[PDB]
Design an enzyme around this catalytic site. Sequence first.
Site, PDB file in Angstrom:
ATOM      1  N   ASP A   1      46.616  32.779  69.517  1.00  8.40           N
ATOM      2  CA  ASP A   1      45.165  32.832  69.192  1.00  8.40           C
ATOM      3  C   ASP A   1      44.823  32.097  67.873  1.00  8.40           C
ATOM      4  O   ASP A   1      44.205  32.639  66.973  1.00  8.40           O
ATOM      5  CB  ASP A   1      44.606  34.274  69.255  1.00  8.40           C
ATOM      6  CG  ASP A   1      43.049  34.337  69.209  1.00  8.40           C
ATOM      7  OD1 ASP A   1      42.320  33.309  69.419  1.00  8.40           O
ATOM      8  OD2 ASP A   1      42.539  35.455  68.932  1.00  8.40           O
TER       9      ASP A   1
ATOM     10  N   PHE B   1      38.877  49.307  66.327  1.00  6.98           N
ATOM     11  CA  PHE B   1      40.328  49.240  66.120  1.00  6.98           C
ATOM     12  C   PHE B   1      40.777  49.639  64.709  1.00  6.98           C
ATOM     13  O   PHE B   1      41.867  50.179  64.550  1.00  6.98           O
ATOM     14  CB  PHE B   1      40.884  47.853  66.487  1.00  6.98           C
ATOM     15  N   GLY B   2      39.949  49.381  63.694  1.00  6.77           N
ATOM     16  CA  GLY B   2      40.293  49.710  62.292  1.00  6.77           C
ATOM     17  C   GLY B   2      39.443  48.987  61.259  1.00  6.77           C
ATOM     18  O   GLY B   2      38.384  48.454  61.592  1.00  6.77           O
ATOM     19  N   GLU B   3      39.885  48.969  60.001  1.00 10.17           N
ATOM     20  CA  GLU B   3      39.142  48.265  58.934  1.00 10.17           C
ATOM     21  C   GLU B   3      40.028  47.434  58.012  1.00 10.17           C
ATOM     22  O   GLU B   3      41.229  47.683  57.913  1.00 10.17           O
ATOM     23  CB  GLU B   3      38.357  49.256  58.077  1.00 10.17           C
ATOM     24  CG  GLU B   3      37.483  50.213  58.856  1.00 10.17           C
ATOM     25  CD  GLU B   3      37.489  51.607  58.257  1.00 10.17           C
ATOM     26  OE1 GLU B   3      37.740  52.580  59.019  1.00 10.17           O
ATOM     27  OE2 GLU B   3      37.268  51.733  57.028  1.00 10.17           O
ATOM     28  N   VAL B   4      39.418  46.473  57.316  1.00  6.91           N
ATOM     29  CA  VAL B   4      40.084  45.770  56.219  1.00  6.91           C
ATOM     30  C   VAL B   4      39.401  45.980  54.860  1.00  6.91           C
ATOM     31  O   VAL B   4      38.224  45.725  54.708  1.00  6.91           O
ATOM     32  CB  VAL B   4      40.203  44.280  56.498  1.00  6.91           C
ATOM     33  CG1 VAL B   4      40.871  43.590  55.333  1.00  6.91           C
ATOM     34  CG2 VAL B   4      41.017  44.044  57.760  1.00  6.91           C
TER      35      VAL B   4
ATOM     36  N   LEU C   1      35.911  45.048  53.778  1.00 12.79           N
ATOM     37  CA  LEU C   1      35.779  43.624  54.101  1.00 12.79           C
ATOM     38  C   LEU C   1      35.402  43.367  55.554  1.00 12.79           C
ATOM     39  O   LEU C   1      34.696  42.399  55.858  1.00 12.79           O
ATOM     40  CB  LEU C   1      37.058  42.864  53.753  1.00 12.79           C
ATOM     41  CG  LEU C   1      37.451  42.897  52.278  1.00 12.79           C
ATOM     42  CD1 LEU C   1      38.792  42.226  52.084  1.00 12.79           C
ATOM     43  CD2 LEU C   1      36.393  42.239  51.409  1.00 12.79           C
ATOM     44  N   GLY C   2      35.892  44.223  56.448  1.00  9.02           N
ATOM     45  CA  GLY C   2      35.618  44.101  57.872  1.00  9.02           C
ATOM     46  C   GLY C   2      35.922  45.400  58.582  1.00  9.02           C
ATOM     47  O   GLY C   2      36.522  46.300  57.993  1.00  9.02           O
TER      48      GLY C   2
ATOM     49  N   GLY D   1      36.300  47.212  62.985  1.00 12.04           N
ATOM     50  CA  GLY D   1      36.358  47.052  64.437  1.00 12.04           C
ATOM     51  C   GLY D   1      37.739  46.681  64.948  1.00 12.04           C
ATOM     52  O   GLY D   1      37.911  46.389  66.138  1.00 12.04           O
TER      53      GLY D   1
ATOM     54  N   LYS E   1      44.764  46.991  55.415  1.00 15.36           N
ATOM     55  CA  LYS E   1      44.225  47.161  56.755  1.00 15.36           C
ATOM     56  C   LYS E   1      44.675  48.457  57.411  1.00 15.36           C
ATOM     57  O   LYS E   1      45.861  48.770  57.409  1.00 15.36           O
ATOM     58  CB  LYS E   1      44.604  45.988  57.648  1.00 15.36           C
ATOM     59  CG  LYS E   1      44.308  46.251  59.093  1.00 15.36           C
ATOM     60  CD  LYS E   1      43.992  44.977  59.818  1.00 15.36           C
ATOM     61  CE  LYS E   1      45.135  44.529  60.660  1.00 15.36           C
ATOM     62  NZ  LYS E   1      44.579  43.639  61.699  1.00 15.36           N
TER      63      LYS E   1
END
Length: 238
Positions: A112, A18-21, A14-15, A17, A35
Amino acid sequence: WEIPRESLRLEVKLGQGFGEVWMGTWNGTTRVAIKTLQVMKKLRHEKLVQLYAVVSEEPIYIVTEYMSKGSLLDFLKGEMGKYLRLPQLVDMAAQIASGMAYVERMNYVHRDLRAANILVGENLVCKVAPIKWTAPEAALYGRFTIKSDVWSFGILLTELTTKGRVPYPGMVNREVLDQVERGYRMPCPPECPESLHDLMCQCWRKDPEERPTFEYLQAFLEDYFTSTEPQYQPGENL
Ligand SMILES: COc1ccc(-c2nn(C3CCC3)c3ncnc(N)c23)cc1OC
């Protein structure tokens, strides 16, 4: 909270960037978001994306409820933007307000809050999950508080009402900061009722203690089409 690694299947990216989803399956029966790389263990609320499970030894896995429409920012920008109208948008704003009111009550600060950080599910469900979105006292002096979150909520209202545009169109960060300290605020966006822009203005008060609580914002938004705009009419975009 801890689950065995073999209970998880990672299906679609799904995404990144640090890791993924990833989207996937938990225990062979549950659609979940996964994640890869303690607050989420304490907090519980229908408008907060819910932790399900963790794998707490490197490589680490975080498992939460799945939100089928991705980020609010992506949702606003995609095929759905064309069809959202003020009642839908005000309703999503109210759900987020509700999320943040729980956070308010629990004594947490989000720090944030903005559309990229909200997730959207079926049936327009929304859930809580850099200068331009940040209150001046926060950006300049690190005074992050629930009141600076309220400021960000004001900016998110404009993301909602412009259907996902960047706040402060055409200004760069240094320009936003300088202008906002000099008292600039975003004008009323096209075809959006003055009464709702006034709510935004309340969120952007200079004195953080004069800004409304989320509990106030949630109630205002829930009641909007009866108490504030009883006579509203859909126009070309809103
Ligand atoms: C803090 O933990 C998380 C935060 C956000 C997401 C998340 N991220 N994403 C997509 C990656 C870009 C949005 C999701 N899509 C559907 N459901 C979700 N829960 C997500 C996943 C998370 O862990 C599974």
